Amino acid sequence: DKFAAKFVSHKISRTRWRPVSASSLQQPDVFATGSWDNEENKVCVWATDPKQLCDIKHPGDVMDMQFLDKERIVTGSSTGTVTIFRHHENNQTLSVNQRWEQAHYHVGSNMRAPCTAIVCSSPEIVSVGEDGRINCFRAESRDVLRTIDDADSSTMHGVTFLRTTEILTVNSVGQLKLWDLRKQGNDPTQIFSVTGERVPLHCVDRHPNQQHVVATGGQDGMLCIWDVRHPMSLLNAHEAEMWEVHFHPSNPDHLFTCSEDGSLWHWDASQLEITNLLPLSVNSLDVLGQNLVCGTDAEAIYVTRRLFS
Amino acid sequence: LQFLRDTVFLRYRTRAYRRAAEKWEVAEAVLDVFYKLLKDYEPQPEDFVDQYVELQGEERVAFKPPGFSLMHHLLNESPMLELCLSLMEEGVTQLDTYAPFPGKKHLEKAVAYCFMLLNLTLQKENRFMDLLRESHLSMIVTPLEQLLQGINPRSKKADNVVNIARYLCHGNSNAELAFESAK
Amino acid sequence: QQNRHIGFSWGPGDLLLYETLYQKQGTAARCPFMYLVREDIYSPVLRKLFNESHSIFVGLQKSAEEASGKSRKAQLVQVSRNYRSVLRACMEEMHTLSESTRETAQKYISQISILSAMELSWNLCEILFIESAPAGPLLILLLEWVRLHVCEVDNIVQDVLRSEKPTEHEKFWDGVTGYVLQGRMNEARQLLAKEASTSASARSMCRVLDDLLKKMPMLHTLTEFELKWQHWREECERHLQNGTVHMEAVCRVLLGDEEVLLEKRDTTWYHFLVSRLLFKHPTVKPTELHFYAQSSLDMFLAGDSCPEPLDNILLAAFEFDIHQVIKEFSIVSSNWWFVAHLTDLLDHCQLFMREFLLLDYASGLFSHHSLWQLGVDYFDYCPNLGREYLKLHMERIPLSTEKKALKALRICEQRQMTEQVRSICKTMAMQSLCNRRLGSALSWSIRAKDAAFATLISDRFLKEYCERGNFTDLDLIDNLGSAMLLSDRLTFLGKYREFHRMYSQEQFSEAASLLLSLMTARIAPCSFWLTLLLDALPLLEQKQVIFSAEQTYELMRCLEDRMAAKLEQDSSIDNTKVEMLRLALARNLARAIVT
Amino acid sequence: SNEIPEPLQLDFFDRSQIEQVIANCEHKNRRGQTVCNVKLLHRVLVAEVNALQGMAAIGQRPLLMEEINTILQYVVERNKLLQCLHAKRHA
Amino acid sequence: MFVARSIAADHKDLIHDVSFDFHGRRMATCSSDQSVKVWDKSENVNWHCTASWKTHSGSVWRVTWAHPEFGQVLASCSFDRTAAVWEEIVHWVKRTTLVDSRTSVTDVKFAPKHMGLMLATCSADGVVRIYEAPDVMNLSQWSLQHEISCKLSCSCISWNPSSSRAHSPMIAVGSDDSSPNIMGKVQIYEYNENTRKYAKAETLMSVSDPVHDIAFAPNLGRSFHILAVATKDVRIFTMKPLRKSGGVTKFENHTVAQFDNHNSQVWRVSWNITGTVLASSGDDGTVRLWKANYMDNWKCIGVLKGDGNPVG
């Protein structure tokens, strides 16, 4: 009943709301979606059935999408190119701002390498990739500020700004590496791994308040709670790979985990209360207060405005 | 103001404290400044007119006095009001236990600051609402008397009023809160 | 053209046509052509249709066991209603598209018409078989069907009531008579409530007609209805006799007069049929409906109008011949969605091919870049020939990003398709390795549990170590654990790295033991033998003796065995090594004989 | 008292799948004889690893054989303990 | 929706044979100007030429792509009795030049992956040679392992795609020799493990006319096999193995379809990915597609005109 399902024609890989001003008591209404597994993929912007406002033909596949600010959307293509789009609200038109065509490319060989994940702290854009590379750019710089080459032989899947000038990266062999952007060396400060297992890690998230709490997800569908200072807790959850984990921004006591089996579970800390919000595969989710949106591989967008009712 | 409010109220809710008592001190400390900011805000006819200053070529609304913004977030259901009511509820519950808690006096002072925040609001509520209707602003405001009866997201009822009353039971211990509740 | 033979190259779902040479040893042209042969599945709205229908199907299949009898019948009717609702929604969406772009409106309008045909046919067939209502309720539902699909009478009456003074319109009596034809008394009575006040005699006659329309026996037990109906018809006939043009015709109708039902047949053949039945035969027999319909068609298409294919389909449905309906539809429609779903529903209705059509549909789903998941879903349900098809197409899907590959593997694993898993894993690993990425290759190899590829990867690591002097990705090598036992070469690498760690952090004794163990087991290749011996050398040299006498004797044996196999600068250093080794061993042996 | 030891540590097998073989062994020869026969069980176990093709990396065979022996011992122990419990219950 | 695409071939001379890869994105176009061009497909359907090189002086007949598991391996047979193996270095590089054949190598076919990398070349002398590369990293090393004499001029070869262990490897060999009386131009060779050599199993005596092209159909988990023979008329056969050793298991043959609708010589026959739709070419310049219905009745489903338009 809560969820209103509008069927689109493109598999939805990413769903992210437009950051809302805290001072004003406004409710988030505009969110953005990115599509994959199609000949001509695209980036759409919707307003809460959701009505699409504007969309742009995105070259390649939209792997990861982050909202830099209210008017800028940073998208990572599957060809490695990291692009920034400027939203002109007055004319409802998305326009290309700045792009780094060869941000990620495999060593020596010809052809391209995919950009798995991006993270943003205006004006710093750190992008990891399948190749061992942690390229760092700036909103107005036409050049790459720093490139940690051969950082990880294995494909890196995700990235997040632990503290400042520090990034936590997960890789295909099950290793959480703490990196530092000030040290000029190309070696990780610390490497956290489960003893004996090499289960790949797909997702990583940091607690909004305390910076020492990091939650990650593996191919075994297990939620591992880590303490970067001191895995504290291993939680059995899904019976299949956990693609994305997200903490609720306003009230962190709530957590949402999406798996390919098709279950948008909700964890409530405030005895963890686990409930199935949805009745193919759920790829992404984004929550901001009482509003949540998730995109599935069944070419559908599920939007709720009364999540906690 | 923005820094204080946002950061310190967040931490009020969810942030590890080695000492249990330190959880309340932070709240009381930021709540005191909220009180003294709201006490002197006398609604003027120029507060409800706003100007736009050109900072770095981006027309951004100017910063109204601390009181304007300290009120407009109170006459709606912003998490300020929700957290204030939740704080009163927690204080009533913990005080009902009648035990020697850590930071009992601190909670007394903080909830007193909360009740005084409420009691001051109602008068300037009439005044602001009256002025507000005349300035042709777009901001919307619902009086406090309809908000106290709102649906509490925790109890799923309008039980703010019941929580308020219970402070009367503790009249022999905390008479100040008793007087404020009666008022 | 010009006698050029046309070659073909079957790809994964696409035929490539190229014009080869003239066959005979070489009209002058160029050769700039390369066509691709293969839009039901490409329409976006139709994709959404497919998605929702898949979910409906899954729901139905799971509920087949629990729901029984009358409950099950109702559930089936409801499922049919859901399918038709989705069809209607899709049709409505396409209409706004045709409105937006009138340049493609013709194509869209044609598609919309085909969809409507499918939907109305769906409804008719579904009602007759699934609902299987008795003599009376069947005619009630037929009347409903006509009203819902043929809304032409409504448009007429709409234009009427939007006139300036409706009673004087040319359409007025037409819409009244149509309301009466569709069995809706109330609206015709509200209509002639308007003219009743125009004049006095008109008033009187309208009041009489209104009374009859109100007191008309109608079904909402059978014989009683029948006698009341007979009495009402007698009364109407008497009124007609007493009167003896528009109310004339209306009461002509209220009796069921064949002429007046013919002279204003101006809606469709089936509309004519329904009107005729309602008036002439209020009680309807399902078995003779086919004859009635044939007669109605012959009467309506009295000219040279040839039975449309749709008309033929409808006649076959009236003859209760499901097979013929399916056959006719197959010729007209390439999209098998309708056919398959209809067969599925009727199969659950236990009436009777289903597996064949479903297989074809899901095979097309696997020829689409994005619709391949629905194909998997539908192939699974087919009993005997599903697995083979599934395995084939799965193994032959393009794999690019690690995401797609991971999803494919997950799908395979659930259905216990080991061979398919292995192939995919091997392909991925090979590509990864060609582009450096040693770490990624190893993981994929571990997953397919392949000893050969693991051996290969471990060999490359050792080569790199020899050249650089330092091991790369030390951490990856330390936590292999049980994956190490996959290959013998992999096992060697791990133990060597362990020795490296050990002796570095003051665990010389353990390290030496591990080294001697490795050498004696012959896991090491021959070039690593010499390095292990060189390492053993300073171990002996250290003031605190590490190797025992017997261990050094075993090393001696290995050195001598190596010398024999070798036969079947470096040499100088190795001989010096040998001599020092011997001296140390002998001193230790003395100390042991001593101790 | 009851003293059941460690589970199966399988190198190139699935610990969960060995339970089906455990139930095969748990078939009652006659009455209350959930012990199959050491002759049959041994033969079957030896033939299982032969079926597993030892191809390129054929250096793990001694380890494989030790594992067979350990499994047999554990099965025997289980059966003995069950029989003892049954006798205790009778008493 | 049958579409018509006009890709400028950029070829100075007549194109002979094109062949797609396993995953359907890379294709090789050999031409009469002694050049082999590799066209790759981008995200957009547009095709782009990536590598162009000269290969052999003799007329190149066929081009066969290997399974991607072994890498990007190509193969090209020619009039000059050579079979070259190509591989990129990261430009295509010749690794070996198989020249044991004394006559024009006419057809080259890669073995199914389960057996290994076993290239097979049939020559006009009547000898099918099955080579084998021991290590995939070193592709310059190819050792001849089996030579099968057929006593007739070989024209085409086709392996059995079946991966069932019960089905021993089988290879089919045709004969283009226009023999006036000699029949049985299609011979099937089975691999007897006991003798570790290839032995003749069945000879299709029915085919008494020159065989231009043969093609096995995927088994699809069935007891019998399907072989398409292109002669003066399209013929489809069903070889059901008999009951059951020390020798070849004899077969029972039945001709289930014979189409002379081409009214001309059928030159090429190829199945689709699932072996349901067979295509055929002819002197008429038309490609007729044949598909079986639910009653096992084969019928033509499509015909094409020379100018590229479909026949309505």
Side-chain angles (χ1 to χ4, degrees), chain A residues 31 82 102 181 187 230 267:
Chain A
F31 65 97
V82 177
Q102 290 302 311
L181 292 177
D187 290 339
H230 297 91
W267 304 77

Side-chain angles (χ1 to χ4, degrees), chain A residues 131-205:
Chain A
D131 37 50
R133 252 176 181 93
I134 319 188
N135 295 277
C136 313
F137 327 103
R138 188 134 297 177
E140 66 272 352
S141 72
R142 293 185 176 181
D143 293 338
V144 187
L145 308 179
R146 196 198 170 182
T147 299
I148 311 182
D149 276 319
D150 207 9
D152 218 317
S153 60
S154 56
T155 287
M156 282 172 299
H157 289 292
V159 59
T160 174
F161 273 105
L162 197 78
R163 309 194 315 174
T164 317
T165 71
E166 277 198 351
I167 35 193
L168 271 176
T169 62
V170 286
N171 56 24
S172 294
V173 292
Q175 304 181 345
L176 179 58
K177 301 186 173 182
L178 178 58
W179 287 89
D180 181 34
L181 292 177
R182 294 158 292 183
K183 170 196 172 182
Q184 303 299 318
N186 288 12
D187 290 339
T189 308
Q190 297 182 41
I191 303 181
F192 314 97
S193 306
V194 185
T195 307
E197 299 179 1
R198 295 229 161 270
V199 187
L201 296 176
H202 303 287
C203 61
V204 49
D205 200 34

Side-chain angles (χ1 to χ4, degrees), chain E residues 35-55:
Chain E
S35 75
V36 179
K37 298 185 184 297
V38 179
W39 299 78
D40 291 342
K41 187 185 175 180
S42 58
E43 295 171 343
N44 303 346
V45 196
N46 302 346
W47 294 85
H48 315 282
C49 182
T50 53
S52 175
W53 74 93
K54 293 201 172 182
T55 166

Side-chain angles (χ1 to χ4, degrees), chain C residues 376-440:
Chain C
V376 184
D377 302 332
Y378 273 94
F379 270 141
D380 299 334
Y381 287 96
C382 295
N384 47 75
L385 217 54
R387 214 172 191 179
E388 313 296 315
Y389 272 93
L390 186 64
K391 290 176 173 179
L392 258 69
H393 298 107
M394 211 59 193
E395 247 167 346
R396 295 192 102 267
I397 62 176
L399 314 156
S400 297
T401 65
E402 293 201 356
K403 291 184 177 180
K404 199 165 189 179
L406 283 166
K407 296 200 177 191
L409 218 51
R410 183 56 62 182
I411 300 182
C412 294
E413 194 175 359
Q414 298 172 7
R415 295 127 180 95
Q416 308 298 318
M417 293 149 52
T418 61
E419 302 304 310
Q420 289 61 42
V421 172
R422 295 162 55 181
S423 178
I424 299 303
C425 289
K426 242 158 155 177
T427 311
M428 209 65 175
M430 184 63 176
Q431 306 160 338
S432 81
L433 173 67
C434 179
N435 321 324
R436 279 79 193 95
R437 296 246 224 94
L438 271 169
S440 181

Side-chain angles (χ1 to χ4, degrees), chain C residues 256 267-285:
Chain C
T267 309
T268 54
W269 82 280
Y270 49 90
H271 192 103
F272 180 53
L273 170 63
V274 158
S275 181
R276 279 184 55 181
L277 291 181
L278 175 72
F279 291 130
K280 306 176 185 182
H281 328 281
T283 56
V284 150
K285 266 294 298 173

